Design a protein around this ligand. Sequence first.
Ligand code: AMP
Ligand code: MG
Length: 1334
Amino acid sequence: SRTALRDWLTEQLADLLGEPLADVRALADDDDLLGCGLDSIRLMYLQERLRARGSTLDFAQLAQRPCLGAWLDLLACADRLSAPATVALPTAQDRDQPFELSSVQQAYWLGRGAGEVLGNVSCHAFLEFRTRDVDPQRLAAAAECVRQRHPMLRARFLDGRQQILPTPPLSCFDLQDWRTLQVDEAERDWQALRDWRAHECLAVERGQVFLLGLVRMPGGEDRLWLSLDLLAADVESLRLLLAELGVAYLAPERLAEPPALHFADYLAHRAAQRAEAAARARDYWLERLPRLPDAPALPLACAPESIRQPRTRRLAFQLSAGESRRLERLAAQHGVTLSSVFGCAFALVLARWSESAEFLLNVPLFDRHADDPRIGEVIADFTTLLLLECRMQAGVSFAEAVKSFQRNLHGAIDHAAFPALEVLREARRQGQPRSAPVVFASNLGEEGFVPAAFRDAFGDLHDMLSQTPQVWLDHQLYRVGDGILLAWDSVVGLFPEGLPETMFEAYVGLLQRLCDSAWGQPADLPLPWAQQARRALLNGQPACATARTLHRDFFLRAAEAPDADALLYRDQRVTRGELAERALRIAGGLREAGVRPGDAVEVSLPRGPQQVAAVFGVLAAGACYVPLDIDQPPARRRLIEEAAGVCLAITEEDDPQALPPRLDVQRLLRGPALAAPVPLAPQASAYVIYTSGSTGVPKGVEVSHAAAINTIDALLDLLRVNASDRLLAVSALDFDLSVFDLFGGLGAGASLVLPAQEQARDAAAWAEAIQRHAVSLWNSAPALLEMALSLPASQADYRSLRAVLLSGDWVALDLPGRLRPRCAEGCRLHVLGGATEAGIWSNLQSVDTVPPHWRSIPYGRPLPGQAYRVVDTHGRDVPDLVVGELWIGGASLARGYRNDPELSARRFVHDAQGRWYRTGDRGRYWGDGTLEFLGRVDQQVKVRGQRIELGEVEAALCAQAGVESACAAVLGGGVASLGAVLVPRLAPRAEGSMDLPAAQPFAGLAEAEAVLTREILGALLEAPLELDDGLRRRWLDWLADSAASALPSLDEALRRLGWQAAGLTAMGNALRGLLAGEQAPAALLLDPWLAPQAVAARLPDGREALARLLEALPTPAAGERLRVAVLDTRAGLWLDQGMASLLRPGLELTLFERSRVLLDAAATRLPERIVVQALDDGLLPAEHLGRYDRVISFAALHAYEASREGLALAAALLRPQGRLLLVDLLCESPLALLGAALLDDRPLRLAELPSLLADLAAAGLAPRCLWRSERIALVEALAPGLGLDAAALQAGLEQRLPQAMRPERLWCLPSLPLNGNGKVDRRRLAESMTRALG
Ligand SMILES: Nc1ncnc2c1ncn2[C@@H]1O[C@H](COP(=O)(O)O)[C@@H](O)[C@H]1O
Ligand SMILES: [Mg+2]
């Protein structure tokens, strides 16, 4: 009855809150009980009382609607609709026996071992307290009294089990009386004792789970301190050890009763009583296990595997009684537990310090749930560990975040019934390596953490430590005073030195603005202000530029000294006057050709003075130059000419009827000179560099003169570039480092040494050109300079080279090591950062030397006038050392992409901090404000210094007629090659019209294989212990079901199948060799008596199928070449049964496999004139696509994960109108079924013939089923015009990609592998291609 139930709940709440019964009855039905000071510890008690009343509700059901009315309306359902909690408990377990560990004690125990991830430590709490005088004889009594009073305080831990001893062999109390000492010595010795015993691994293996102790300081001070391994205790149990030590010190007679409910009795009861909720929670965790977030991805100075004996460092902050009150009142007004305030505020900090906002944290629940009320006096480890996934919402108030985090935590509390350790174990077994190495422990009992009976004897908690193993950062909370001690037991040296302090200072700041300001304020933290202060300096670097047309300065340097050498090229030179005139003639020719201000002009000239004159001439016509290599291939050039909206192209070719009108630079050099460059305002489009672009369409990066010249000035004024300098422009014109050579170098009036197009990658030409023109300035991607430095110092003298710019790709840490002894005195290497989209660069790390902690040469300070943010995936700045997305900002940015406003809005984003490029580079601001770049998260990679989007390479391969989809990756090995992988499209058909005469087989052959199974198993089942239990259970039954029952025959079977007693003897012995040699399972495929294809090739009349599959190969009678391939080679063992008439005169035959080792076992025995080709790590080298007039599959199509795998592979491998020849098991071969059992791989793979045909016709091949039917069916099928070939791909790549990004090696898969998100597995494919490089 509902009113009687509200009375019962009122009485439970009046107990659990301690409020009066009448006052609690006066709470309204919708009045929030967390809004009255209910918390989770009380609510699990109330929920346990409801469970004990048979009124079964989950904690989450009560907790998602935490008010009396909602509880009553849940309960009016549950008292008739919900399951009874009735379980037959074990009423006792034998009290001295080595009983099982609780799940969280198993975690601590396994974490105690030296080998485990961040292991080798206790899990102990250490507590320190102060007082003037206390008696050691009271304390030595008190410690041994509490060891005898509570079973768990003397529990030995061995071998994954715990044993309550009679009395432990080792003392409970460490008296350290030092009233003898000098204070300074005792205080340092205290620090030595503190450091030892607060990190000490307690001797739990000898039942010392806890050790009290007391230093007596010569300053007249007793530092009572307490080491307790939480293997023995909940921190709630620890504060009861404190209460009892308090009474046992003060008045030991008042210790009421040794609390009777022994911990083995509790674990037996609790495990059985949780068991259905644990199985229900297990279903929930299994459905989430591939979807768990990881560890909080915090900035680690060391890998957690690599610090061998982790000291905890405590950080702590006593929130005042007033701060606590303000959190408690706001928490109540916002309907949340005080633990959810702290857990949410901590998860916001962890989110803000993580590379991802989704992570686990290990939340130790209280789990004191047993029927005897004295369980709340027992001292065992009643913790149970909740693996809280939390998934912190960015861009919300804290009120929204804490309610979300509470509903998440409260929702997860029932799912803690399956313990966090078994979740993580099941993750490790499922190949999900995950851990929850950040702990969160709310210990908020209002009596105080240190209980009254102990505070009356000793000072309130002076200090403490955790030592939780596997755990980086143990965040406890305690009531201390009636305030709240926040503690972060971070691990020493795991994090960067400033970080846990800085992160905790931001956590305290967060909790204080939660005391002191309403929760409608953002959950998204400020940075720790000092981090934002540093970064606002480094971003705030002043413009350091005069906003002007980009060409202005060169035309000034020309007007100021017309005779000075502007360009040096192929051992001739061009003056600034000559170049300015040549440019202004081009400009006049361009205005004559209808080009006009901020309209755009392609420049596509071989590297040399006419190119430089043309870009200056475009700019001096007022136009935006759109550089492309002359090597840029015609279809790609048409994508760019189309996308750029380009007015004109300059190309040495005259063609006024091209896509843009295309012009001879030599004719534009006949043009009248403009008397000046056209006046452009600084913001006009200056260069549009066509970077590679991920949809396949290349992308024009439209950079204003202001933007370009802000980078250039910021760097000219740093290099101190002057008229005596000369630059080697190894920069290609469509790679925007050239824009600095071009308008920086000549704007300062330094000369440009240009390589010829003949010298575009030629280190020896650069070395000659540098030593010949005494080049002072280098500028490149470091791939080009490492190439230049690979010439010896005797062959390539760079001592003229005053200063060096390295850019746009990873500088190796030893490149300044190679470079400083090679280049000039005053070497001035600068490594520069930032993308095409940001003007020519955006950072500068100078490198006089590399300090050893650089893992890469960082992006330095931002260049003057431009800036970096590093952001979370929600746009807010990440804290220092945290990885986030590099946003380049400020005056240097490109205006956008030339005609892609939507991709521009995706990249050039606007924020309260101005305009930002959102690069997709990852990186982190170090504590010194330097910006370590950390590579890229996305499909964009660097090939020979140049930028490539793998999405472009893939799209340029999908642009092949015949490709369904593609993958690309830059590969491992010293070659650093770009690879790619193809799925062909199959041109499907439906082809059920089939005309196989089925009649050749007879049932006596399946009976004969049954008799041979009776021979082989009848012998090996004299020694069935050679097998495993799966082989035994199958083969003992199959000795009827596949060998004799309903399959009678004589040993004439063997004479019908064709193998005789020497064969059977080798089958039995080779199988014993497979079993007992430890080579399982793969050695099945290395022996002609073992393998499913080798047995099939004679036993099921696979030889009479082979007599037809060995035919359709006309080459010797044709007098002419036939190209043939085999998919199902394995160790070659079926070809060995056709070999002489298989290996026909005139033939090309190629072996393929899907492993190396089996094909190499084929090459070890088959004649080496046959061509050998791995499909290494699944992967077909594309040099074989469309090559073969005949393709073979043989007694292994079942072994492909679909027929559609092998059939698409065959269809790709076949030349058009060439033929597949396919034989496979459809019916059981009883002996191939032994082999299937030894692979332990399903004989359900053996197709029906209609299904084989439907899959094959879906793979587009037109079939005829020929012969040999249900034992082994020979199908041929004939290839459509799939249109792929090696040379056709190479030609289509040569049409659509420059030689920078055509894959130097190319492959195919019948489908791409998916990672666990359902996206293409570019890491597995990068590895697979790397393995396929050999
Ligand atoms: N010093 C560098 N080290 C490594 N990568 C760099 C460096 N400088 C620039 N990059 C990055 O390389 C990426 C590819 O080059 P980009 O074509 O300009 O986009 C960009 O996102 C750049 O920020
Ligand atoms: Mg770029």
